[PDB]
Structure 1
Amino acid sequence: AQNPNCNIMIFHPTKEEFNDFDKYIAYMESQGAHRAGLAKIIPPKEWKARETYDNISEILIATPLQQVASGRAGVFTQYHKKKKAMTVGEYRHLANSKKYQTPPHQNFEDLERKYWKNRIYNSPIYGADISGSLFDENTKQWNLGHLGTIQDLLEKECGVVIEGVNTPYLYFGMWKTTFAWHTEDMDLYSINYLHLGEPKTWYVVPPEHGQRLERLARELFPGSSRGCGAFLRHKVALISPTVLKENGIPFNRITQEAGEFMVTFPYGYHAGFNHGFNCAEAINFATPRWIDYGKMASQCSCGEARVTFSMDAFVRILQPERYDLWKRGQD
């Protein structure tokens, strides 16, 4: 069995191996990459996402979110307070202001310590889930706006044509902006490209140990758990690496830098934070191996998680028994 310790693997494809996305994902899985829940892919040196980032300041962040924490330093929830619209240029200036900028630090490990010690005491502002792309239309390899759609994958594997579309989203971050512990909708893959700026630190639980995380989460967030059998789908709960180690939860950590891709695998719980001003692009995707995870994915039916239009069909076709209840939560 390849990668039995479930370590995060790092790949360095050649330009020739970068030509066929599906084939390269399947190659990574033949080496056991999926067992970690997360892999890093460093693109060939010949590749570029686009020519420059000099013309992005007029993108609009229509609903910036202020991430307000409650709890203790190692175990907290965050809610997202809506703020007034601002451009990327305005957001970048805000991120670099004395109130929000990255503090002085020695290395990534010192910054991580500072994050976990101090995150709850501040409320950073995040631009999330902005539909759009920064890949040049003439970038032909690993262009996240030109990947095969999940609806086409389901049709190829299962024979059923469904409505829906699958497009990329941009994320503008600053110091301390945080992504809570979650798996992807319908336990999909994700791919994330860090276009520019400061790094992003990731934590991940191996898929084969996901239920261990879930059990801890129900203990640490007992009211939320009573409210919803799938409350991590609300994307609000944070648990530090010190708390995870204290509770014997298997996990790994890695820092992504600008110019690097990360892939999350089906049912790989992950969380993390941004080091400073940055811009990432991400999209969900599927492979044949995903189908069986889609059929088993939990779902939020309490009303909180409220998701994309296109998730309807996945629930309807892969989880017909759950469909009725889930849809009542969406209406």
Structure 2
Amino acid sequence: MFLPPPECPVFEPSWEEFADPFAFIHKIRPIAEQTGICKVRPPPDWQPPFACDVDKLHFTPRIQRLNELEAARDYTLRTFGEMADAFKSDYFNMPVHMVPTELVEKEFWRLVSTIEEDVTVEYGADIASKEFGSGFPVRDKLSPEEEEYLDSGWNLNNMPVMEQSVLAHITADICGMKLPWLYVGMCFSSFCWHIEDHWSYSINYLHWGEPKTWYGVPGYAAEQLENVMKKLAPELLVTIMNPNTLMTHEVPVYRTNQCAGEFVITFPRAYHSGFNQGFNFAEAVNFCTVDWLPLGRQCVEHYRLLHRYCVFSHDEMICKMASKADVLDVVVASTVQKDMAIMIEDEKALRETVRKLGVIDSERMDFELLPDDERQCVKCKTTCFMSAISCSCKPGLLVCLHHVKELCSCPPYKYKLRYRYTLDDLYPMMNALKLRAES
């Protein structure tokens, strides 16, 4: 038996509300952050055209064996869809459009929990927009109808580069966290419980096909969910776990059926999972708002405790924006300035601590020029930028300032503090942000 979780919130914005996606996301945040995910239906006439040749775009999908708590060939879009439809109609012995969504959901959770069944499916997942092309129109002759949607904020190609996005002036290739990803689904293909890199937002648009079923958990319950999954499946790596099991342990869970033409938004640190009802085509991108900035700093601290790799350096992003203060949105400048003040005070305290450990020598270093795998802390794997410690006895190795004692057997007077900026360089950068924000 499966008891469906309660429905997440659904918004139907007016044209005035819809005109600015970041203003609308900030508007709904008080409600939606209490449920982790939400759904947005655009105005009825917002109808971006989709054009793909089903025969000229190829992919190799991942094979999925349906098993709860458990951690190939080439298709065209046409041949995948023929495989997908025949699978679903043979599975239920019905036409695909007659299979109720409540029954597919019930059957999915039965399937993953029975070991007597060996059902396997395929999922065209994490296809890069760069090779395959986007489902939204982009500049590359386009029709006037496609030109109408080129500059829409809800065209997911635009959202990362708008002024309210805090990566808009970041030119580093912060790994496809600025380019959309595509997902070609079939019946029962799924995504496991997870949160986004650096606790970012995500936004997902279903271009066409049968619905995508979601489950979501609010950001405030993240550690509660993690404690529950540690007790029940310590081997974890992500997995499928029945939402009724989380609910039994007092974790709040919400559901929705996302249909063609609808958006789903996930909020910072919000766990989510789901599965596809049938053949469909989705597109998604990550993004970061000013709301997110202090959570982004908390996230990198949490990664350090766990010894987890970073996708980018948060401090490097902050300093890059400071160096472009004159072209930032004024509310962006204000919020970056507050995060930078915390950064500088934490950095000041860390440098005093390592000096009292006996590190005396020092030298400026342009960390941003090193490949990422050449500037990770030996102990905690954090990506260094503000500063690190090196030792002549172990060339090329770095520790962050929390892990001075983990580098060398040599005494600390043989160490060197490598630093990007003096404290005296940092305070004028923060003042430029203040001037920008106060005007």
Alignment TM class, shorter chain as reference: 0.7 to 0.9
The answer to which structure has the higher strand fraction is 1
Q: How far apart, in 1, do the equivalents of 2:18 and 2:88 lie?
A: 41
Q: How far apart, in 2, do the equivalents of 1:108 and 1:299 lie?
A: 38
Contact conserved, 1:7 with 1:35, CA < 8 A, in 2? no
The answer to whether the aligner puts 1:127 opposite 2:124 as a matched pair is: yes
1:77 corresponds to which of 66, 70, 81: 70
Contact conserved, 1:162 with 1:313, CA < 8 A, in 2? no
Identity fraction in percent? 31
Q: How far apart, in 2, do the equivalents of 1:85 and 1:21 lie?
A: 37
Q: How far apart, in 2, do the equivalents of 1:195 and 1:285 lie?
A: 19
Choose 1 or 2 for highest CA Rg. 2
Structure 2 residues not aligned, in runs of 5+: 1-5, 139-146, 319-342, 351-374, 384-439
Aligned to 2:35: 36
* SS at 2:295 equivalent: helix
Q: How far apart, in 2, do the equivalents of 1:152 and 1:283 lie?
A: 15
Aligned to 2:199: 187
Q: How far apart, in 1, do the equivalents of 2:313 and 2:20 lie?
A: 27
The answer to which structure has the higher helix fraction is 2
Q: How far apart, in 2, do the equivalents of 1:14 and 1:294 lie?
A: 31
The answer to whether the aligner puts 1:277 opposite 2:293 as a matched pair is: no
Shift in alpha-carbon separation, 1:276–1:294, aligned structure 2, 3 A: same
Shift in alpha-carbon separation, 1:218–1:42, aligned structure 2, 3 A: same
Question: 1:22-101 maps to which residues of 2 (within 5 A)?
Answer: 22-29=22-29, 31-50=30-49, 52-53=50-51, 55-61=53-59, 63-70=60-67, 75-78=68-71, 83-98=72-87
* SS at 1:194 equivalent: strand
Contact conserved, 1:95 with 1:101, CA < 8 A, in 2? no
- Aligned residue pairs total 295
Q: How far apart, in 2, do the equivalents of 1:101 and 1:290 lie?
A: 46
Q: How far apart, in 1, do the equivalents of 2:381 and 2:8 lie?
A: 34
What displacement does 1:38 show? 0.6
Letter in 1 for 2:121: P
* SS at 2:215 equivalent: strand
Q: How far apart, in 1, do the equivalents of 2:18 and 2:179 lie?
A: 21
Cα shift readout 1:144-168 (whole Å, capped 9, x = no counterpart): 0111349984468xxx956125100
Structure 1 residues not aligned, in runs of 5+: 1-5, 225-233
Question: 1:183-262 maps to which residues of 2 (within 5 A)?
Answer: 183-224=195-236, 234=237, 236-262=238-264
Q: How far apart, in 1, do the equivalents of 2:206 and 2:51 lie?
A: 12
1:265 corresponds to which of 264, 267, 286: 267
Letter in 1 for 2:268: P
Q: How far apart, in 1, do the equivalents of 2:216 and 2:87 lie?
A: 31
* SS at 2:188 equivalent: coil
Contact conserved, 2:54 with 2:76, CA < 8 A, in 1? no
What displacement does 1:317 show? 5.3
Shift in alpha-carbon separation, 1:24–1:181, aligned structure 2, 3 A: same
Aligned to 1:230: none
Shift in alpha-carbon separation, 1:197–1:161, aligned structure 2, 3 A: closer
What displacement does 1:252 show? 0.9
Shift in alpha-carbon separation, 1:253–1:323, aligned structure 2, 3 A: farther
Letter in 2 for 1:326: K
Q: RMSD value over aligned CA atoms? A: 3.2
Q: How far apart, in 2, do the equivalents of 1:267 and 1:206 lie?
A: 8
What displacement does 1:299 show? 3.7
Q: How far apart, in 1, do the equivalents of 2:315 and 2:88 lie?
A: 43
- Of the two structures, which has the highest relative contact order with CA contacts closer than 8 Å and spacing of 6 or more? 1
What displacement does 1:176 show? 0.7
* SS at 1:291 equivalent: helix
Shift in alpha-carbon separation, 1:27–1:323, aligned structure 2, 3 A: farther
Cα shift readout 1:183-216 (whole Å, capped 9, x = no counterpart): 1111100000001111111111111111111001
